[PDB]
Design a protein around this ligand. Sequence first.
Ligand code: HEM
Length: 110
Amino acid sequence: MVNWAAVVDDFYQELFKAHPEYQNKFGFKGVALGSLKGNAAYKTQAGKTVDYINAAIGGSADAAGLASRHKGRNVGSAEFHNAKACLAKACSAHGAPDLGFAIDDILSHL
Ligand code: HEM
């Protein structure tokens, strides 16, 4: 099956490399990017992100709910447009399908 866990790991490397300040909103704030895999808070976030991707593909994802929760952290359209770019890179590096359609669904509620 598609190694979405590896995709998500690359996605967060790309995201925080380009926008390090985004990391400050997480429980792994301040942690070196190259060490995130050994961080408990990151492990949980990465898993939830993978789950969301599998939910989007499976048809169960609550994009409105996810959008609302991100607004609840002051994360909106600008951030998700930036994320769309990083995720496209991560998917391409793994021969995985692009997830732009899934991010657009979230953007439609932001
Ligand atoms: C590909 C785009 C993204 C996906 C699929 C995604 C997915 C998720 C998911 C599934 C959760 C957990 C929601 C829950 O527990 O109900 C979450 C939480 C969160 N996301 Fe995102 N996210 C994305 C982009 C971003 C970006 C760009 C930021 C910028 C700061 C961000 C910030 C956060 C924060 C701060 C939380 C809460 C973390 C916590 O509870 O400690 N996300 N995200």
